[PDB]
């Protein structure tokens, strides 16, 4: 039904100025949700600064020069999302979309043999025709023969270049997770104990590396490794460590004083 | 046209609602089918989403299953004998779900003899599995009594005006005795 998107109604995760135009590009249906996605036109023009306007952003995309998960995408309304690999072979830059500690979208540089895998969270399991088991991930993928020990909430390590799963990480006590929603988004913690309330939401308690304690809904956690030491994915610079605003304000004042 | 909304109904307090919006296409209804006995005649209806419904107008054939033996056969409908809503539907001979009908008993008698070797098979031959399955197996007298008469009561289990079929199941047990008392 709806086809437009006003700029004021657009998500604040993007950085769009209210005084520049009335409209924002409406993402198409696809792998990721509208409210938790970054369209390809925003990445090319507003973040990488490769395109000065939206006319030049169409020249780059309709030539198939941008590959997402080892596949060209020529739609500027394509909804790229969490744990996605973006590669531009002409410029030789590879990125991964993650959340920083504050909660904003972050592009993390990657290298070869690391830009070949991605992590997917299982959200549903069902039996298809012929009695085959199928698992649905958080980005729309459908795996037709998962590990027999796979369960809802676990993380599957995928190989985008060759298209088979390589490993499985289970979700239970004593594991490393990253929060992907709420007020604690982008914080890397460690599962302590999960409360199970049938019919309602489940609450998970996590402790940071520094020892800070926090909680969030169980649907907002994403297992990424056995513990904080051996993570299976490169994280942004702060390593999911939230700092006090009082100290934060002080260092920037000192650093800028000596910046000149 | 016809609508299925609650805007024209009174509130539980007895008051009247002031309608301030026009009728929407999403809440429409359609006229009934009033299926009847006779030679087959159906008409398709395009429903929401592009799907199709088969509105049957006349039918005289259907699929009826013997639940005890877990079999089924295609037979011909003979008459309508009972309707719980109103006996004016029995007079008009309309076919709806859960109505009671009488179907042809000839195909079921033939399968009975071919399986259990009982006639209500020219040569016995080596085929003597009849005694193999006739043990620990009995047939109620009520079912067998009307099998030799020529017709057997059945219950319609499908919605003829929504799918265009009249499929059913044979009455047995306490359900059979319930309806045999009303019909007398």
């Amino acid at each position: 039904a709806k086809k437009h998107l006003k700029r004021l109604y657009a998500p604040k995760d993007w950085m769009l100025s209210k005084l520049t135009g009335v409209f924002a590009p409406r993402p198409r249906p696809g792998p990721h949700k509208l409210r938790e996605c970054l369209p390809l036109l925003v990445i090319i023009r507003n973040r990488l600064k490769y395109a000065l306007n939206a006319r030049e952003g169409e020249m780059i995309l309709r030539q198939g020069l941008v590959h997402v998960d080892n596949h060209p995408r020529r739609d500027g309304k394509y909804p790229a999302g969490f744990m996605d690999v973006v590669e531009i072979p002409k410029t030789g830059d590879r990125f991964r979309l993650m959340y920083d500690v504050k909660g904003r979208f972050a592009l993390v540089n990657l290298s070869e043999a690391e830009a070949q895998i991605k992590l997917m969270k299982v959200v549903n399991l069902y039996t298809a025709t012929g009695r085959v088991p199928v698992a649905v991930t958080h980005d729309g993928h459908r795996i037709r023969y998962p590990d027999p020990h796979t369960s809802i909430g676990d993380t599957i390590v995928y190989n985008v270049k060759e298209k088979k799963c390589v490993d499985l990480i289970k979700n239970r006590q004593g594991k490393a997770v990253i929060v992907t929603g709420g007020a604690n988004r982008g914080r890397i913690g460690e599962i302590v104990k999960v409360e199970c309330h049938p019919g309602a939401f489940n609450i998970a308690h996590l402790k940071d590396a520094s020892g800070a304690e926090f909680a969030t809904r169980a649907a907002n956690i994403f297992v990424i490794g056995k513990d904080l030491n051996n993570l299976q994915v490169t994280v942004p610079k702060q390593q999911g460590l939230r700092m006090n605003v009082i100290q934060e304000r002080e260092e920037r004042l000192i650093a800028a004083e000596a910046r000149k | 046209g016809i609508v299925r909304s609650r805007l024209h109904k009174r509130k539980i307090t007895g008051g009247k609602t002031k309608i301030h919006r026009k009728r929407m296409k999403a809440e429409l209804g359609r006229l009934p089918a009033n299926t009847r006995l006779g030679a087959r005649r159906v008409s398709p209806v395009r429903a929401r989403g592009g799907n199709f419904k088969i509105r049957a107008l006349r039918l005289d054939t259907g699929n009826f299953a013997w639940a005890s033996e877990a079999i089924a056969h295609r037979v011909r409908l003979l008459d309508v004998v009972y309707n719980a809503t109103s006996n004016e539907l029995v007079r008009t001979k309309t076919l709806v779900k859960n109505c009671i009908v009488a179907v042809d008993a000839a195909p079921f008698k033939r399968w009975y003899a071919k399986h259990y070797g009982i006639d209500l098979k020219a040569s016995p031959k080596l085929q003597r599995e009849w005694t193999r399955r006739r043990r620990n197996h009995r047939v109620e007298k009520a079912i067998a009594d009307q099998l030799r008469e020529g017709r057997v009561l059945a219950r319609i289990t499908s919605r003829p005006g929504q799918s265009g079929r009249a499929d059913g199941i044979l009455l047995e047990g306490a359900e059979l005795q319930f309806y045999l008392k009303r019909l007398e």
């Binding site: 004021l8 209210k18 005084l19 009335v22 605003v245 009082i246 304000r249 | -």
Partner: protein
């Protein structure tokens, strides 16, 4: 329509428009600093009021509070940068003693007068408006320019000026 630029007001007319004690006190300030109209004085009254209410709310209601360490040193940094407060004094109670003349001192028109470049406040006004004065090699034409203490020793004549 569909415009989201913001705007607000900066001054406020006084109640009781005919107080004798207020009328003569404002006339001393207007002629001492060379101001053009009473709207300049009423503008300073508004910013001074905003400073006081922030401190009074922050002073004792929240006690030692993360909302007191924050924007408790920011105001002092703001006050010390422009010169509205004494360096020795570093408690929020001492910002409540700020007066209108103190803020009026740290004006570009006043600073030029006390620096010896201009003989009188009215002469300083015409110099700034004539683009004969620059701060850090930048021409300034606004007599309301609040000079920061860091740029105090940077104010001089303009290179492009005949002076």
């Amino acid at each position: 329509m569909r415009n989201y630029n913001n705007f607000n007001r900066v001054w406020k007319a006084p109640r009781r428009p005919f107080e004798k004690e207020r009328l003569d006190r404002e006339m001393k300030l207007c002629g001492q600093y060379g101001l053009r109209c009473k709207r300049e004085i009423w503008r300073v009254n508004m910013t001074l009021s905003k400073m006081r209410r922030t401190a009074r709310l922050l002073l004792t209601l929240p006690e030692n509070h993360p909302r007191r360490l924050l924007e408790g040193s920011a105001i002092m940094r703001r006050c010390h940068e422009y010169g509205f407060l004494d360096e020795e004094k570093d408690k929020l109670d001492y910002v409540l003693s700020l007066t209108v003349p103190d803020i009026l001192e740290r004006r570009l028109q006043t600073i030029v007068f006390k620096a010896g470049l201009a003989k009188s406040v009215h002469h300083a006004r015409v110099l700034i408006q004539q683009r004969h004065i620059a701060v850090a090699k930048q021409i300034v034409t606004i007599p309301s320019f609040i000079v920061r203490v860091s740029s105090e020793r940077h104010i001089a004549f303009a290179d492009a000026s005949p002076f």
